[PDB]
Amino acid sequence: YQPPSDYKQCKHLKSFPVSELKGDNKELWLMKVPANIDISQLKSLPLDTDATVSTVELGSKNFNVLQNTSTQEGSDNTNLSLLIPSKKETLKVATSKSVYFDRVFTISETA
Amino acid sequence: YQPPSDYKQCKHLKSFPVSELKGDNKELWLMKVPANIDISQLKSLPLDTDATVSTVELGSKNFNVLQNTSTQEGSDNTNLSLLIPSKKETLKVATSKSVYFDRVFTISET
Amino acid sequence: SIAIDSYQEDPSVVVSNFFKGVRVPKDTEFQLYKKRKQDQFVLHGENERLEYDGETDELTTKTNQYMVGLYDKQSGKINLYRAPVVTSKIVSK
Amino acid sequence: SIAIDSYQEDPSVVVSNFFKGVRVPKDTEFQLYKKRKQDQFVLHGENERLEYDGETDELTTKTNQYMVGLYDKQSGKINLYRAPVVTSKIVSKFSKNLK
C-alpha cells in the first residue's frame, strides 16, 4: 500500500496509555466538542455523568451538554473502536479481553 | 494587545544560528518554491547562481527559475528582514549595523 | 553542487514585508500567532487476510472536534487526548 | 469537580468507524497519514515607542511555500528553515499622527 499525493506518513505519534485503560477503577470518555473551543486552554470540565440534557460552564461560555450513551437511542457503540501503537506509528485496536466506549458527549452553543 | 479568534500564541519556537549571519563565509537564501514539493525529501538544491534566468531539477518534475535578485526589480528587498527568537516566547531583529536577504528565488512548475 | 545539509518543518523565522528601506529598532519585541486548523487524515489497516481503509470528512474536521479520555470514577480526573474520527471500510486483495 | 489533567494536540490515538459490531484482530497493523496544509499566521511587534501588525495571504499559504537558508560558499551546503511571509505595517497608540 501507498498513501495519496499530499498525505505524509505519521511517524512520531504520542503514546496513549492502555494500562490505566481496562481498569477496575477507570473509564473511557469521548467528546464531540465544537472546533471553536481551544481545549488546550481548558483548566476544568465540570459536567453531570448521571443526566441526559444539561449545561456546561467553560470559562465564560455556557454550552448545552448531551450525554450520547445515557440516551438509550444510541445506547451502544460497537461501531467505533480505539487504536493504539505498541514503536509509535504502529497504531492497533486497544485490548481488554477489544475496547468499546462508555460515556460519550456532545456540547453545543445556544442554537 | 489581543490576537484574533482562531490565531493561537507561538510559545515554543525553534532556535536559529544568528552567529553564522554577520560573518563573510555564510549566506542568506529566500525562496518562492511551489507547495507541491516536499522539501523534507530533498537531498540537494543544484540551482544556477550566475543565470538570472535558469531551471531547477528537484526529483522528476523539471523546475523553472527566476533568480529574482539578479534583476533591478527585486534586486533590493529592504523590507524582507529576518526575525529570530533569542527567549523562545518573543522575536527580535537580527543585528549587523538589521539583516536582509543575500540571494532570492522564484522556482516554478512546468 | 549546493547539496542540502538540514531542513526544519517547525516554525522558527518570520520574514516581514513592510516597504523598501524600513527602520526597525532592537528594543521592538515581536509575537507570532499560528491559526488553529485541524488537519485531515487517512488510515490503512493490513495483515495476510484483510485490508482496512478510511478517510476524514473535511466539513466535520472544521465544525466539531473529537477527543478521547480516561476517567477514574473514584478520583474524578480526565486524561484527555485529541483524536480524529476515521470512517473506514474492510477489503481483501 | 472532574478537573482536566492533560491535553495532547499532536497525533496519538485514532477512533475508527467501520460498522456496528466489528471483528478486528491483534495481528492487523494500522498506518495513519496526516495531510500537509501549511497553517496561517498573525504578527505583533511591540516596544515603548511603536507597534508592528501583520497577517498572511491565505491563497499564497496554499499555492507556494517560502524558505530561509544559510549557504557556505567554501563548503557548498544549504541549512534550510521553513519561514512564513507576513505583510506587516507600523503604528503607535495615536502617538505620531495626533502628536
UniProtKB/TrEMBL annotation, chain A:
It comes from the Eukaryota. The chain holds residues 25 to 140 of 243 of the full protein. This is DNA-directed RNA polymerase I subunit RPA34. It comes from Candida glabrata (strain ATCC 2001 / BCRC 20586 / JCM 3761 / NBRC 0622 / NRRL Y-65 / CBS 138) (Yeast).
From TrEMBL, chain D:
The chain holds residues 6 to 104 of 407 of the full protein. It comes from Candida glabrata (strain ATCC 2001 / BCRC 20586 / JCM 3761 / NBRC 0622 / NRRL Y-65 / CBS 138). It is found in: Nucleus, Nucleolus. It comes from the Eukaryota. The lineage of its organism: Eukaryota, Fungi, Dikarya, Ascomycota, Saccharomycotina. Belongs to the eukaryotic RPA49/POLR1E RNA polymerase subunit family. This is DNA-directed RNA polymerase I subunit RPA49.
